[model samples]
Target: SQWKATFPVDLEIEKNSEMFALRYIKCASAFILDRRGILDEKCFKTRTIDKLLVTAFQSSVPAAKRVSSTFDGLRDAIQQGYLREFAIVFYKKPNEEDINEVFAFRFAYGDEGEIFVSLNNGIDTNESSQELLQAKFVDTDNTKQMFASTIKKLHRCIKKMEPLPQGSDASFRVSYTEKAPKDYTPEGYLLSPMFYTLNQDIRKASIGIVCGGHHKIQMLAASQYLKQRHYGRVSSILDVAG
Candidate 1:
């Protein structure tokens, strides 16, 4: 609706510095642990994110520093679970006109795994432009003005997240199920997503995988099959990497 189009675009730039937002927002994953094991392929989980600003004076060196600082801060926010999983859906090329029209949406996850969206703060374009000029997160670079608004909103949504509960791993877990590999479990049993992936693909690939979640020998043999497939050439090379 034309009525819903106007919100402060400047809030986007004002919240996240240009250098930081451009790089961090496109990231699909993050590495948390590097725990090693014997003859096994391992998997890990990567989930959602958090930030700072610098002055806008003649010398922008301070602002430059703020870019990395804000990035680090935002990364910490996600790692510490202050932010959860989110999806950034781009509408189209961010041409000047399209950019101004709001090209993206921010979706957040609730404690109960519910999804919520907060559209523009009800400010129209006429009011938002003027309000943008007074915003601290607004970038001095005119090029960034149009896009920074959404970035600001994304970070703002992340900021609203609460901390993890006592003895939590800082990760939210919901009941996830997957197809149980043959012989590993009874004919009709549901397991975690990891188990499903392993039985369906990972094990099929014959990769040596040692997961505490499923100690199924039949599944292990699937990996062993992979191990032998390339045992002569593959494991030989693996021995060097190990």
Candidate 2:
């Protein structure tokens, strides 16, 4: 069976669109699952997380100068047996100022190192060949280490930039689905008031203040909630709608 999970992070998405953030999270989640062997269903095969991470990381790079050998190694891994595909769909409930719309992204890799990215819902759908240049990983052989290092580098780079007005807020509901969800209604699940207040505190707190103990507790509590819920356990599968 396919599995998915959705969680919010305090990512600074000023340099990229919400769609990019959604795509990044989707790949990141899938990578985590693959590493844990959760994606390996006996009846079906799944794609390699390394290939997905390589493409996702390349797409997120702000600038690139030339292709690197690490990317080549990941591509080779894909050709061996890592053959799976994943999709991330973002659902935005209609707000007073915006209409309801959904964004879907599907990622796949070819044996020849060709990366395919599809944007559904009438958005731009095109294949990308951007080289991975700026970010460097110490151990290209280890996909997990590569993913973690690249993410750390990217996070450090973003920290130096000016923060966005509402960078910490979650505007859209993200999910990992085989296909996009049709319903635009908001989710009914409610987090505790304590979580809400802490969310606000972290959002409003200065960067230096967020490094304090309270912020650490908030993150720990949030992680415990997800763990309690058995995050990544797919509750329901939506049928593909034409």
Candidate 3:
């Protein structure tokens, strides 16, 4: 017998910023899998894990410089066995409204772990817009290279830090957001209702994943859902320099 269930969960976000909402959605996806007991050994083997992390990191850097600070937290989480891995996939198109977004997901090994994923969208006042443009245009291949090098640097930095002091618990926090309600809405409700709607096409795409076996299926479902619901019209593209 197949055990299947779908329910909405509460997600917090800022009111006017769709970008922040998108960021939360990525995090929420990981949270959802974690809650459902799906982010396990079986899930980690899928190719979607790394893809999701790469995309999440790419979209995250432009909005805030402090994201790197969370590396310590990630390291701690991993060492304590709270988190196994995290992944994000970002998609952007020059002329489309829904294209510049991210899909983030993660895995946690233990039930008692507390992991914080935050992106401070408000800070980095200077060059934020320019950085966003750079993020939008940079191709995925180049982004992967950037991600690869950064991971190498992160490993080096981790090695230099002193081991966690005895009797100290692990903690992680990364700030990133949107504003609609101060409270989280139930699952299936749109976090950004003004910008998104509950359409039949999206519903069908979601329903198609009844089995809930692999991360790739979820990613494909998301891709198809987005492609069907949005991306309706082709707008003329313009070339801009960063």
- Per-residue alpha-carbon lDDT of model 3 for 147-215, expressed as tens digits? 344333333332343332222111111211121123332221222212211223321111111001111
lDDT of 1 by residue, 84-181 (tens): 22111111222211111111111121112322221332111233222222323223233233333433443343243232122211111111112212
Minimal lDDT window, size 10, model 1: 210-219
lDDT of 2: 0.23
lDDT of each: 0.21, 0.23, 0.24
User: Model 3 shows how many backbone clashes?
Assistant: 20
Task: Judge candidate 3 at residue 118 and give its lDDT.
Answer: 23
* Candidates arranged by lDDT, highest first: 3, 2, 1
TM-scores of all candidate predictions against the true structure? 0.19, 0.24, 0.26
Top-down TM-score ranking: 3, 2, 1
Pick by TM-score: which candidate is best?
3
**Cα lDDT, model 3, residue 198:** 21
**Count of residue pairs whose backbone atoms collide, per candidate:** 9, 2, 20
lDDT of candidate 1?
0.21
lDDT of 1 at 232: 6
lDDT of 2 by residue, 98-172 (tens): 211112222222112433333321122231122221122222133234334544443343334333222111211
Candidate 3 residue runs with Cα over 4 Å from true position:
1-137, 172-176, 185-242
Q: Per-candidate RMSD vs. true structure? A: 23.6, 19.1, 21.2
Which candidate number has the best lDDT?
3
